[PDB]
Amino acid sequence: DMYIERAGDITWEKDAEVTGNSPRLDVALDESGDFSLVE
Amino acid sequence: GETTDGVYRVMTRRLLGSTQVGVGVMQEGVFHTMWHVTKGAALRSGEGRLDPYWGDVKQDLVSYCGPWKLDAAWDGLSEVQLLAVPPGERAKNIQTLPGIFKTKDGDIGAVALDYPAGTSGSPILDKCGRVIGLYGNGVVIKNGSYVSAITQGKRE
Numbered sequence: 474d475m476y477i478e479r480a481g482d483i484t485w486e487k488d489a490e491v492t493g494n495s496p497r498l499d500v501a502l503d504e505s506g507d508f509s510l511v512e
Numbered sequence: 513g514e515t516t517d518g519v520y521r522v523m524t525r526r527l528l529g530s531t532q533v534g535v536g537v538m539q540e541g542v543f544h545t546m547w548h549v550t551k552g553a554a555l556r557s558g559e560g561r562l563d564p565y566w567g568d569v570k571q572d573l574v575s576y577c578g579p580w581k582l583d584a585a586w587d588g589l590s591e592v593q594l595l596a597v598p599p600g601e602r603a604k605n606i607q608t609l610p611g612i613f614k615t616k617d618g619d620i621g622a623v624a625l626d627y628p629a630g631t632s633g634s635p636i637l638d639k640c641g642r643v644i645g646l647y648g649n650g651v652v653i654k655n656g657s658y659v660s661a662i663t664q665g666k667r668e
């Protein structure tokens with residue numbers, strides 16, 4: 474049986490750690506909800 | 513049970529010890545997570561029981577206790593924050609500029625951050641703290657890095 478536990482409030486934080494890139498990817502979404510890369 | 517607004521961990525005792533299978537958002541008395549996290553199964557909140565209300569495998573979303581409530585959208589320009597809830601670790605905000613998933617049916621934002629699979633369901637927020645989607649359904653790129661869609665449902 475699965476259960477839930479509170480982990481925090483949903484707020485935007487000023488001066489959070491800023492990271493990650495912004496790729497533009499060609500993708501396909503199948504009937505099972507799986508994304509895949511298209512080339 | 514617990515019905516306060518906020519980000520919650522989704523746990524199980526089926527495997528060894530207590531294991532975090534995902535994360536979700538409680539808003540307006542409705543629990544919102546990704547379908548692959550619960551497979552549509554009922555949830556427990558202390559003494560309370562949360563029953564599924566709406567779900568769709570292709571969108572990879574499910575709501576409990578009521579219809580999907582999250583309607584905010586990424587503006588296509590601004591940075592956002594992944595409010596990451598990793599397994600056995602504290603909730604952490606990570607700011608990033610989303611990229612794009614280009615599909616035959618239109619474009620969707622995408623966040624390129626590396627977290628374990630048990631982080632699926634963590635909310636993505638705009639500057640006013642509104643949930644614009646959930647993190648956790650995407651693709652693995654060349655290096656083994658992860659890029660998630662900004663997955664958002666429809667508020668009826």
Ligand SMILES: CC(C)(CO)NC(=O)c1cccc(Cl)c1
Pocket residue numbers: 625626627628629630631632633647648649652656657658660
């Ligand atoms: C590639 C890694 C291990 C990067 O940390 N992540 C995943 O494979 C993954 C899969 C599904 C959902 C989410 Cl959130 C992450």
